[PDB]
Amino acid sequence: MVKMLVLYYSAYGYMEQMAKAAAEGAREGGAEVTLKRVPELVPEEVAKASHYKIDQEVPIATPGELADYDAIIIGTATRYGMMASQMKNFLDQTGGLWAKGALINKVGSVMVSTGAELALISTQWQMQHHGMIIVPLSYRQPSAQELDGARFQGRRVAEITAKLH
């Protein structure tokens, strides 16, 4: 039984629902799925000031634990065609995992929300830099087709990863 990390960042909750949909779908694929969220840079104070809606009970992920799983799904809010600062900051910390060859041949996939395509591509590229195998896409609040897409995607990744083990 393969283990999967559904790591995500959301600012307004949209991506979190996508992440949960992907995780639930991945469980249907027969994988031990873990839903974590990237740590918030900038202090706990003045963070929930103006705009905010981060979830509390989603556990925070560590840059080093990413080598423990067989498959990683990354979903992030994006602006102006690139990752949010929080997700970018987190992935740069996997420098010890990169040279070690830790994430080589591990299965990966990406979800994004709002420059959507450029953001999707930028994120996939960073995962490819760690030698990860990439599983492509589908083909206010998330629509029914988005949630189904994330769900299918999540199951498809779990289904592929198991086939590799």
Place this chain on the structure above:
Amino acid sequence: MVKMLVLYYSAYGYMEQMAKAAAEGAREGGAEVTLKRVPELVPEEVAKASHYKIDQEVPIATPGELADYDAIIIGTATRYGMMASQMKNFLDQTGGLWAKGALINKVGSVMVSTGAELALISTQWQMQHHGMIIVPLSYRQPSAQELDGARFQGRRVAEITAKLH
């Protein structure tokens, strides 16, 4: 035993050597490897005029046959950060393969030569549009490290594809 297509385009021979290195490596991975070249647009006349060095005995590929293989490796010469016109023209013809879902979940990989990164990304994206699983890179005449990279890449793809069957 999986079947692989090493499809390529080369203008000065560099990519052809890369293609042959990838094919040979893929055979070592235990796959029935076929080395084809995309058809040359513009007539046979005035084609070999100024600059030219296309290989004759490499068989020409058809847009429709791409669904016959389990894995496809694409290698192309690039200019100004994008595919050569010949490779772009060929892949657009796979419109019947796209909607049919023919190339979904088939394993793929890309090699490029000279805007290298943008070209590598543009090509991978088109393959992802057909729902192909992507296997990332290595990590005058081709250097020893390039040929070894293409070789390893070719074997790695064949090795992965077999694991999926």
Place this chain on the structure above:
Amino acid sequence: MVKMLVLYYSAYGYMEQMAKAAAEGAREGGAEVTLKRVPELVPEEVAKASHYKIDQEVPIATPGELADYDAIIIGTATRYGMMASQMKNFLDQTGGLWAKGALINKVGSVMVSTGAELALISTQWQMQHHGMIIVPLSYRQPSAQELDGARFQGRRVAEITAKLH
């Protein structure tokens, strides 16, 4: 009075209307505007077979004439996130214009139609490779907002180019 080239490629006419809207808008900016279309690769025969709707009276452009204008607007149909083969083939021919430094500091802009963003970016990059100054975007048949966007864009480019002379 600056001279502008509105060069385009269209397969179903959408981009041609965009091109005409950009040209008309550029005339309102006070520029001698020329509307040309990239030459069609593959023979005149079997070209208008299945799908076709290229315009006859739009004059065909030559790869070398691009250095005659002060501003160039490029508009192209795109598939799977990149240029159409016809536009890509044409721009690669500007190799004599590149090393000569012919297109350096000339004003340019891009329009695309259907991978839209990746295509827009890929095209702009090739123009930047010739050292062209880039003017960014707006911010069945073309909608009223698309035509107005192309129109404004066309005028804005003409308005900028004149300011540089």
Place this chain on the structure above:
Amino acid sequence: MVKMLVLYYSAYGYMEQMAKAAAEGAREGGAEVTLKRVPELVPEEVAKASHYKIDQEVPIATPGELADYDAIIIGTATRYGMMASQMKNFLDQTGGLWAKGALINKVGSVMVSTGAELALISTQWQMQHHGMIIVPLSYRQPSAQELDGARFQGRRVAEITAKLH
């Protein structure tokens, strides 16, 4: 006399030298040049711990002041093909400048250092989203050709910006 902001981020000093070279070159173009650095996220403590070499006397920039200048040059260190977290975090804060139309038609340019091309493109795109006119590139420690490139680029931007006023 136009005013220019040479805003930058550097982790090991390479980009700072590029920034200074661009600023000095821009002064030779006849512009009031201001050299600022993006604020460092994460507290002052444990920041200079392991690796560090940020410059003290370079003044820190504010997200809102970017509308005060006529030209903006952005130079940033990059990893895995995208901006550093610090530069990305800063530019997202220009949301009030975007909808206001503050940065429209202002001249801009980008420098990067180490995924170089993808990073250069990602950054330019964000500037284009604010409607900024883009001036393309050249065509341990920075080499003589890099410094000359940044210098020329800096002067070229100042030279162009003045022509627009």
